[PDB]
UniProtKB/Swiss-Prot annotation, chains A, B:
Protein name: Peroxisomal primary amine oxidase
Family, per entry: Belongs to the copper/topaquinone oxidase family.
EC number of this enzyme: 1.4.3.21
EC category name: oxidoreductase
Predominant location: other
Residues of the signal peptide: none
Gene, per the UniProt record: AMO
Keyword Manganese on entry: yes
Length: 661, 661
């Protein structure tokens, strides 16, 4: 058989060979049809099949490839599965009223089409840009998001237009006032949204940020600062076997796909010989960046980056020394292009360990701290950085030596901007960050998808709220009124889980195994979600934003596990009106399904609300976002105590050294 | 004159010479009186005097020393001021119904007194410890906090008793059931709180954490991990002139005192030649760690560490390479002992710079990210670590290159523990973290004191709440219901400022200068407090905890500036019942005073609520806490753009290098 070679691990992404094998198979199946490839990626094995293979000597799951194609002259898409071993299409269906994720190829041609469009050219002339300077006009190709004038009838993009006085300028200080709508398949402008109040191109200098620009703007650059060198002469402590990582007792598979980007699977912790499962899969499953200006056509700015462009497709090849400093281990990403040929993104993921301050410390005041023990912490970082036109999303999955797992995100890049008239007030929907530049308010929301396996199978979730004792001050039960406890509300049905972060109770959430008990505390083993950057969805109920991102309405959504329940806003996000039972809305159903002690899926909504300020322009300083999953009642004691201390002196040793007591 | 030499800077802490000069002066003034020194510290110059001296060629402020002494046979204390230049007491008063901060000397003798007390010995015997093994009994000397049976009539301490089978053990796995009350001045036990239900000493092995213990507990220690070396071959970029720091345009004075520990003053940022003030003073002014068990005598566990022991007095001498890694610059601390002689704590503060990931980045998708600019961030850290008996508080004041200032705190050390009977349930007020060990619930709350001078004098504060537009979905004003803005509520009077963090609006607070305007945004320059770890005070209104820490009831308290308005729970905290108009309660008054565009003081309450778990025992992994002050509308653009990029390639350069276009 010409079947491609099987991977080392069932969860390994498709190899370039498998991708090509998949596309050859699809092409043969659709022989005579003019088709193009939109997506060719690994169809992960069923959860049960994988676990049986992994721990019960079960059979090796079939190596499958999921594909999405377009056929010239045919509406929507066609999707299906290819069994790589037998090189055959085993599943396929047409979806004529849906539009797929926009690939780099899908987006690359838009700029040239608007530049050569007569209606667009006329608009540029009207805006103060001569027809013979169209090479100075640029545009960020966006999914149209959703426009009720066309639905999914045509595959559309909207173009946010900008102007560069010089090719090296940062165009964002000079947005134009109109918005062209482009037919992706036909590669032509079908309409242009033009404001009632016209604003011609800004005549100010561009707000630039490269050194040559800064030298002109301010005196010059600051002197090169003294270097801070990081070296690991004896190598690193982590061990990579293919995509399998081993570090500080943690063991997991590092996967990656066009959409979610990094995908961490089969996460376990070796508790002194007892290898205990934690999570079967964890990743970012969707996002939405809803803008806050009510004015047309700005309601169309609420990109669901992961589902509409792909955190994988948009990922940057990481530059050693700059993006990832120190001794780095890189991983590449493989996708398919429109023709069905494998494409590779080098250094899409970087892995390394860093010093992370103190892990723990304690000194005895009795001998003036002579008795002391200090142990420094080391963290393991698995990261990627993707670019969504103007913004940059830096993602860092962090593993720590106390057994905690953290997701750190840094937002940078450039503010989305729209033109502002000389006599126009930007507030309250935006900020004038530069003359004639309006940076609209917006939120950055993410959907963390957790498939738990806390110390094994059979899990539950709960909200934990800190509360004062119900007994009043002066009562026998709370004489001095200081009593307080943690109220744990275990979610029984899906409906019970739809909860938001609450500052009034310093709310946290537990993902636990009700089938086990901690021998000391008597509480079930668990990982606690500690997350406070949980903005409420500001768009109203029934709004386009709320309908297309049903998951964003609550900080936490817990539903029964089902295979292929990955994307909360549906499988094909672009141009979906938000009407219909799909994604999270489908999984929630009538909210009556059991989620207590069974296989569950935990979707957490977190992020920030951004009100632009001049400090964010013309290039924005990194803004941090973070959440953490901590083991609570999982271990019987601090799991990092067997790590060699950086310094340690006992009381007896102190007496000896001290002098002679 | 024998007056001690003046310091280089008016805000420099008292030198050992000044301390001795101060105590000699006080002793002479109280000639014939048997006095002891409790506190001898710098009395900082009036805010106005300092600023006039600093920017208006005003006279050098008088060098003053504040002292607190006890007189044998006299109730309370005596406090006053010494004018160092003239070596004379210029101010003095007796406070007979107050008790002062407990010094290391005040606390060091308690353990020996209980060991030799007959009533205590009897209790140990009754608890299962032979009278001839009292050398195995230990106790953490605590302020009694407040006990209505004695008020401030006697200076008291309460002793949390523990047992060590071996001097090298960590005693916390073996607490005893009773609590001795000791007269600090008389050095004798005056009472012992004994529970109705007796619990004899635990017979389990001690829960230890040193390597030798771990080798016995688990197989052995983990192998020494490969080193991660940090070097700065060409030195550091920051410059210290005495206590004056200069780094990345920031300039400030690093002070330190027995109580607040680190005190950062006169903070400014050099905005390309324009030196702009930010804060006149910032520090931690008080804390409270209220425990949540209602059972007697646990209501007495709500230590206000800063005001009752002193973050300075408790600070650890930092060990190079372990506590502070890299090229470090240290500062020492100087206090007075009971006799009036200067005492020194070496390396009380460490200063250094660290790599802090990416400062900002952006790449153009047009040439597959060939056009890119990446600049790494460096942060300046000013830190200290103090020990409060069982806990360790690691404090890190962080300055960043985007102009933001952050306060990072890591809590470590050991859990406060009380005995648990074999048949005793710890919940809901605590957790059984080890056999017979009950770790009670508690909160860790801090009072950040900010004396702002945002871009000059005349400041205001406000709450910022993210809100959806009031207009409904489908209205002409909010057609698609996505509109949202930031509602700014400027505090007019003190009463308006008493606010809490609100997750429902992702609340932040602004400290701004209403006298100035950002030329681009049209908003006043400001520093925004972004802080989400703001627990509500769980102790009830009218409770001992709420009364002694009036500031902890709100996340934010803003009052008019007045000289010497430093400590929110009063100047002499130990044993105050919480009744009376002092500290924050006095500053708030009837809440009608103006705080809009004037000299204000901003007190922020933040921290965490701790529900112990076995992972925290026997030694707890560092738990993080953080808050940030960001410039918003302060600058007209990202202030870090003139920093040499780690990597930078323009579109034109990319074309040249790319190949040849
Ligand atoms: Cu943003
Ligand atoms: Cu704690």
């Amino acid at each position: 058989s010409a079947a491609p070679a099987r991977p080392a691990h069932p969860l390994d992404p498709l190899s370039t060979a498998e991708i090509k094998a998949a596309t050859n198979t699809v092409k043969s199946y659709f022989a005579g049809k003019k088709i193009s490839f939109n997506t060719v990626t690994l169809r992960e094995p069923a959860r049960k099949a994988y676990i049986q293979w992994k721990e019960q000597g079960g059979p090796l799951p079939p190596r499958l490839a999921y594909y999405v194609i377009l056929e010239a002259g045919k509406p929507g898409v066609k999707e299906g599965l290819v069994d790589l071993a037998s090189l055959s299409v085993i599943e396929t269906r047409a979806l004529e009223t849906v539009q797929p994720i926009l690939t780099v190829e899908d987006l690359c041609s838009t700029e040239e089409v608007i530049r050569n469009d007569p209606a667009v050219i006329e608009q540029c002339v009207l805006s103060g840009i001569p027809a013979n300077e169209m090479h100075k006009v640029y545009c960020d190709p966006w999914t149209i998001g959703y426009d009720e004038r066309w639905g999914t009838g045509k595959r559309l993009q909207q173009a946010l237009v900008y102007y560069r006085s010089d090719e090296d300028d940062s165009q964002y200080s000079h947005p134009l006032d109109f918005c062209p709508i482009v037919d992706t398949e036909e590669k032509k402008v079908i309409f242009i949204d033009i404001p009632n109040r016209r604003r011609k191109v800004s005549k100010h200098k561009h707000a630039n940020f490269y050194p040559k620009h800064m030298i002109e703007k301010v005196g010059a650059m600051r002197p090169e600062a003294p270097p801070i060198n990081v070296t690991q002469p004896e190598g690193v402590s982590f061990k990579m076997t293919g995509n399998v990582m081993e570090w500080s007792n943690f063991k997991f598979h590092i996967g990656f796909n066009y959409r979610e980007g990094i995908v961490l699977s089969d996460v376990s912790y070796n508790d002194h010989g007892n290898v205990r499962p934690i999570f079967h899969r964890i990743s970012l499953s969707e996002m939405i960046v809803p803008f806050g200006s009510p004015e047309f056509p700005h309601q169309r700015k609420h990109a669901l980056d992961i589902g509409e462009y792909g955190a994988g497709y948009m990922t940057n090849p990481l530059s050693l020394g700059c993006d990832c400093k120190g001794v780095i281990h890189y991983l590449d990403a493989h996708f398919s292009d429109r023709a069905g040929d494998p494409i590779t993104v080098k250094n899409a993921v970087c892995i390394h360990e860093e010093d992370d301050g103190l892990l723990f410390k304690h000194s005895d005041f009795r001998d003036n701290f002579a008795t002391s023990l200090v142990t420094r912490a080391t963290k393991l970082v698995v990261s990627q950085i993707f670019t969504a036109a103007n913004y940059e999303y830096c993602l860092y999955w962090v593993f720590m030596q106390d057994g905690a797992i953290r997701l750190d995100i840094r937002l940078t890049g450039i503010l989305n901007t729209y033109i502002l008239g000389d006599d126009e007030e930007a507030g309250p929907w935006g900020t004038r960050v530069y003359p004639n530049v309006n940076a609209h308010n917006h939120q950055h929301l993410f959907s963390l998808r957790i498939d738990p396996r806390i110390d094994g199978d059979g899990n539950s979730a709960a909200a934990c709220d800190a509360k004062s004792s119900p007994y009043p001050l002066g009562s026998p039960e709370n004489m001095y009124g200081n009593a307080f406890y943690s109220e744990k509300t275990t979610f029984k049905t899906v409906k019970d889980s739809l909860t938001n972060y609450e500052s009034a109770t310093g709310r946290s959430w537990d993902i636990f195994n009700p089938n086990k008990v901690n021998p000391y505390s008597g509480k079930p083993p668990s990982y606690k979600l500690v997350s406070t950057q949980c903005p409420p969805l500001l768009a109203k109920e029934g709004s386009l934003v709320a309908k297309r991102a049903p998951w964003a309405s609550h900080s936490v959504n817990v539903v029964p596990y089902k295979d292929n329940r990955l994307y909360p806003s549906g499988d094909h996000v672009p141009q979906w009106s938000g009407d219909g039972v799909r994604g999270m809305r489908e999984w929630i159903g009538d909210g009556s399904e059991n989620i207590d002690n069974t296989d569950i899926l935990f979707f957490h909504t977190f992020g920030i609300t951004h009100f632009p300020a001049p400090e964010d322009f013309p290039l924005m300083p990194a803004e941090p976002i973070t959440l953490m999953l901590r083991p609570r009642h999982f271990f019987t004691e601090n799991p990092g105590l067997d790590i060699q201390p950086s310094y340690a002196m006992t009381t007896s040793e102190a007496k000896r050294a001290v002098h002679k007591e």
